Amino acid sequence: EQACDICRLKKLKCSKEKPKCAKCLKNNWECRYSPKTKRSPLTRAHLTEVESRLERLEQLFLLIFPREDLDMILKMDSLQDIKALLTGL
Amino acid sequence: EQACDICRLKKLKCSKEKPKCAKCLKNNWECRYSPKTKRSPLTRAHLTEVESRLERLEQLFLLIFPREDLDMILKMDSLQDIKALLTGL
DNA sequence: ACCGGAGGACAGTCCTCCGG
DNA sequence: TCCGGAGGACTGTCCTCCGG
Ligand SMILES: [Zn+2]
Ligand SMILES: [Zn+2]
Ligand SMILES: [Zn+2]
Ligand SMILES: [Zn+2]
């Protein structure tokens, strides 16, 4: 089943043979089969672990700071910004 | 297709007839077909939105509580109590 | 009666690779 | 060449209701 890295990236049929394969072989490229990427399980128990801890950190957050701040953090991607937020106390 | 509240809790086969079904007519029972109860979507995109929020709060709380059992706190249910606690900031 | 879990239709993923 | 998105095997859900 697994297509080689390059065929994946390019989205063309892979011959998939061993070691290399038609277009990496032909075209002159180093053909690889990368490991599947580890992702979190998409189960319902796990979505619920995570929604319900996020909820409880939100509940605790609100005893400490205003709701308007909740909404800012819940969007920040930068670690300086998450820290500065906290520094304006 | 939908089974009745009761056949649902008792786990027996439901006749499904409306308004009152098999048993619920028999045992002269309060027969409800309660509406289809919502869950949040199990999709990858939504698992991931929620995991990004949780990470950001998780990070914000590493700085509020650099010292431990945040989990102790996360389990409490009382608002006064939690706030009595935190005022040991 | 009661309820753990089998059974199965279905929701939605997460791959490959076709074709504009 | 290139990538949107179709195709479709599959993972895991989430019902019902069997039979112990
Ligand atoms: Zn290939
Ligand atoms: Zn290759
Ligand atoms: Zn019924
Ligand atoms: Zn009924």
Total structural domains in chain B?
Answer: 1
CATH code for the domain of B12:
4.10.240.10
| Method of elucidation | X-ray
A21 CA – C20 C1', rounded, Å: 26
Reported structure resolution in angstroms: 2.4
Nearest chain B alpha carbon to A65:
B64
Rounded to 5°, angle at Cα A29 from A25 and A35 = 95
Q: From the CA of A24, how far away is ligand 2's center (Å)?
A: 4
Residue B82 structure tokens: 């939690």
Asked if A45 CB < 7 A from strand D, the reply is yes
Please report, in angstroms and rounded to a whole number, the separation of the first and last CA atoms in chain B. 56
Contact criterion met (CB below 8 Å) for A5 and A36? no
Closest to B60 measured CA to CA, from B80, B78, B52 = B52
Q: Which domain holds residue A47?
A: 1-89
Q: Which helix (H) or strand (E) holds B56?
A: helix B44-64
CA at A49, C1' at D6: how many angstroms apart?
Answer: 34
